Amino acid sequence: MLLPYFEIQKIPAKIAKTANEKILSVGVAQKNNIQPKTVTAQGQIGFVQHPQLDSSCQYTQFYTPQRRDIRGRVARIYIQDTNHMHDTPQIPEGYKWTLEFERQAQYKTPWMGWSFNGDTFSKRNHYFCTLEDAISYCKQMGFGYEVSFPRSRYHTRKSYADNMLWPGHDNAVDEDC
Amino acid sequence: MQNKYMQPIQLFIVFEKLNSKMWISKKLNSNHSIALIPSNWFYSINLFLKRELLFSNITLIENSAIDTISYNLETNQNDLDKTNIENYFFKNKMLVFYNYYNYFLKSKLTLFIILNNLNKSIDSIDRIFANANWLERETSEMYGINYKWKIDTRKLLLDYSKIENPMLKEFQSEGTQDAFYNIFENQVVVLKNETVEL
Amino acid sequence: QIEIFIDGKPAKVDDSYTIFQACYENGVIVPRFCYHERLSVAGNCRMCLVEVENVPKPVAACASQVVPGMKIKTKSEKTRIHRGNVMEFLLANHPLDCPICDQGGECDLQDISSVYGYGISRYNEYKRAVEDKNYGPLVATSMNRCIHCTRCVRFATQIAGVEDLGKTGRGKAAEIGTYVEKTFNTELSGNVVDVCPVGALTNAPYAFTSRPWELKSFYTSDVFDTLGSAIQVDTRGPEIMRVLPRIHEEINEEWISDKTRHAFDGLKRQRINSPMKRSKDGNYEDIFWEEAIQTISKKCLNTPSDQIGAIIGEFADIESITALKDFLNRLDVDNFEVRQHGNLKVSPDFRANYLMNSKITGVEDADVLLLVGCNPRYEAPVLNARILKSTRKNLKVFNIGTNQDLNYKNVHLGNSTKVLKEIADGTHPFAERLKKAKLPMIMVGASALEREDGAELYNTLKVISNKTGVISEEKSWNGFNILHKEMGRINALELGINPTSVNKNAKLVFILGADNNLRPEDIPADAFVVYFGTHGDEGAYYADIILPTAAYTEKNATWVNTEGRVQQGRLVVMPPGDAREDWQIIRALSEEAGVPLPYDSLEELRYRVAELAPHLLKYDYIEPTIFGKVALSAQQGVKTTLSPTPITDYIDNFYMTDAISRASVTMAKCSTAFNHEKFSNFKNLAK
Amino acid sequence: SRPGDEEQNEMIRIASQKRVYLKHQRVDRPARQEAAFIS
Amino acid sequence: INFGNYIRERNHYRDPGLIDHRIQLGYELLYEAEMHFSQHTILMQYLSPYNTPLSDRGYSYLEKVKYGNKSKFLQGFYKGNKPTEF
Amino acid sequence: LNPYSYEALKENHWLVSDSSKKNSEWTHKSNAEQLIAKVPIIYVDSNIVRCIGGTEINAGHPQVYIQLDTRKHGTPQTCKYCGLRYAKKM
Amino acid sequence: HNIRYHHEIHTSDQTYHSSYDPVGETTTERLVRYGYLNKDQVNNAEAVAAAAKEFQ
Amino acid sequence: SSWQKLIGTNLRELRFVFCQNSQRSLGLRNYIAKNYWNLKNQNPNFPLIVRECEEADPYIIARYQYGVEKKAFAANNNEAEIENIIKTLVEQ
């Protein structure tokens, strides 16, 4: 499903706590003013929201003694349709929202020229049926999010009769040279 | 079809306050019935099952859970109706299923429970069925299920000194740590892992 | 509004729909090979045949309009038989080429056969064989795979505007392509590959290297041209493998230019991977970040304020320019140019001063377009295709400047600036031609505004617009447009940097990745140069200090479109070697120089940006402006004297216009194969 | 009856409903955005 | 004190069922530690200091001397986040 | 002739050529290019030739059909599975 | 040379679903819960009959 | 009137940020729409940056030498008080 709760749709305002953000308090206020108040699948303006590391981020399992880098990351939430190479795939795309994490380290170990990831996280993408589900997951796990909204091909009038049209009278003079 | 079948309808006759939603499918055995059960009646329902005649000769065959927060149809998205059981996999945080076999009625019974609370809490039935101890321990450690009134809550298959739920969709199959020998300490340690990718 | 039936479920559609359109809107997928959503309707293949009651013959869904009360049965056995027969005929002569075919894993023939075909063959004869043709280094041909779907012919005729493709012959022996040995040289050429459903036409640079299932895709925007084309980047590990177009319908529609698609391989070579320092004799030594930053900090602390200058590069993002502007303002520096000529004579006071006020889609809305020193065929090929589509729908194009071989018809008003003076002073028929037009539109190329009389040309254009009615509150229309040539200049204008503030004599120059229009006389011989950059073609040879930076695909940044749209460029792979982010380098340098900047992450830098200009925080959006008539008001007593010099363009070689494209191999191959053939001193009078 | 019955019934009712998708939805070309000018 | 720092880092929790689950896990890990089920080099990850060297070996203060008054950003800029050979 | 020249690239599928064929023992880790170049051209009587790369089906490669009626008479063509080259007899 | 029926036409994929109301639910509760009556018009013959006919 | 004839050697930039349609930015919007060219003519080189957003608060940001900024809130300020705010900002 793609098209379907108020709190999940509510985007909290930023509160400055760091000295750097206390310096730029006017910018924080302006960002709070201009950003959309609520997020819905019908929106047109994308936006970036910081992680909310309050009591709500208690459900994450990725805060371990050896890992202090997963919580607080900012994901990307968007719809990835079928590419421009084929029209009728056997498994179609575009029916779900993708949450993606940017790469953190990629190199080639030299003994056999083998590709290695310096960050085991962010290797695979996460899939949700609704945008609200992805935002709720991010709020649960203490993730920020960059939400971008889909672009769709317009509807147009198609007919075979358009291939055979009368050029018009031979006396139609073009005054535009 | 080509065999004697009857629904397990007496269960909802005794429990008069519950809605009844049952399925039969040709993808299952012809004696297999699937029903939907609310979470706040599961312990009483199992108490009724363990002792009621024509149900008492029953055994618990399997237990597990489904993380449906990332469940999406990949093909034939326009062939779904309101009666499909998969229609209950949407917007639901967690699912739990139990499978029993009844010798008197020669029947398979699967019960499905929808967990929609963030802490994933449900009553345990290991005090009714002795099977449920290890099964529920493994389910709880794999999927983060919080079982209440359980005989034993210790980890069953996971490594010592670790807290993780590897069977959630958010978890990558390579984990977050690797085990190496440390010369400076003459013993094995765990470190953040860098892994090859194909 | 009529009611039809699709597999028993009633539905309501419009009477102008085809069966295919109704089925797709109602969620029903119909296989197809020759129908395309942007080309004309053809019915040559028959894979979209469906079954309808009271109609004995199967009806082609794509080429047949809906009838009130009709019933379409796409799940009947008759439809299955029709699809199986058509698939059998399609595969009778297809070659056994899937292992060697670049279409494998994403071939529509393969998937359609697997899902709808009978699943086995009975044809046991010789297949036809076709000799391959040579179309150039961008398109590879394997013509045994062609199914005669006409998609390439229709794309070339109706989208690219070139008439070199066709179908010659008859029956089974007919062949698709040019009759003679001729290359398929054009911008947007590679797009035809994406149109062809089979491996008949393939991406020649992307030959044999990769498979679809071993790629990860990212959504981003292009910077090679000032249109922010929406693109998809496909990578395998740390290597970027290909670039594909996306769908936007307000930018580039479905299509990308060849430079956008192929010049990305210039990021794999000539890269700067570590900080460097140059000796007096010219020797370059690799150094640490700490030493370089300390050297530049000592220079900043010792150099007087009036001797400090900067150059803003072509590929400069909002964050980098914000960082550099804040740091140099802290250093009491307000000059961001040292070059004597080539500066844009536009005030950054208002957004309407330097932007495309009618947006990219405005070419569809206007009826008269006037280009002034603009060559859309090279500066924005997708916008050129849009203008061609509009001219097929009653759009008239007039041109002042160099006559160009646009694929449509344009009227040459003149060559020099005397035509503009005649129009502004009246007594020229084009003034009345503009007045009688419903929505006049003027597009001045940015290049013509770096003339020594760029301000006078700007004032003349404002006078012409206000007098004719290009800008008018009655029509609620703003037809004044500027087509820029650099993304960094657009970002600097958006932040508020005056491009005409030039330091005459600077002893310390920060070159933020600028390589175009750089000559040794611009930089004094006794100056200290710090170049921030990713490539070593130019600028890196002027620099005492070289600091490696991140490309557009290697950082999370914000880019402003030439029409005013704010977009996210997203990180795809980290910068190679020891390179660092631009704003991170500037912040580290500011901290080491005793004037630290109040931001430590991208979020705080964006808070500073919101302090400067809030509209840069709205992504994939254009902020409206209500000061168009105030900004473009014809001021009294301003100079309007123009030099009697012809107005030209700025592009000679389309394939190589910047450092990344200059460091590309496929761009060099395209130059070698196409520059001699595309060069002409005369107009093609056919078009 | 038990206190938690109502939530269970509500989540049962929510699950079964028509599920349309964002794609396959008709989007027309928007009209020209007329420019507004201050006095 | 180190384990108290761990608990303090888990202070923001507000779901009682989650807290009961965590208490069960803590009791389990403590029992594993007290019966030699786990290895000392593995279980020491919960008792180790957060910003202090261990007492059984020496420590290096090189990055303290070179990056004396520099902020955290500058320290993380001079020391990269990826290998530099590739 | 310069391998980077226009003519050499145009007559080599727009690839930089190697007449010695000895770059492939390092780049492609084998000497197969030399060995296949050691095989002369096969002259066929008809206009079309069928290649399977062996004496029987499943011993070789899938059946492919190569056109020998070229724009320039007698231009040899190469099988895309096996490196064998064919031309129409006279 | 016969290829039209290499793929199965009939397959064992049928599923059958049964849904029941609560057994202990009375007629009045069923009428009220289904939006054919309100709590005020309970214990009235005309309201019960109208709700029953509307349900039927 | 003499204050706007010359811009002080300490002032470097006057940036105006407000809303397109909100009643809060009504005074600043009208002031910019009436007195922009009067200031621009007397100081043809001095930058006067105007940026607007959908819900931005009205601000008059004055920048001085060495990167010193002084941002003043200009909400619900009519023509005279906007005049006075700008005069005081260009006076320090």
Ligand code: SF4
């Ligand atoms: S075009 Fe290529 S992948 Fe596609 S079916 Fe034909 S040979 Fe196979």
Ligand code: SF4
């Ligand atoms: S070469 Fe390909 S795209 Fe062109 S007409 Fe043939 S099958 Fe269609």
Ligand code: FES
């Ligand atoms: S898709 Fe309809 S005839 Fe080709």
Ligand SMILES: [Zn+2]
């Ligand atoms: Zn062969």
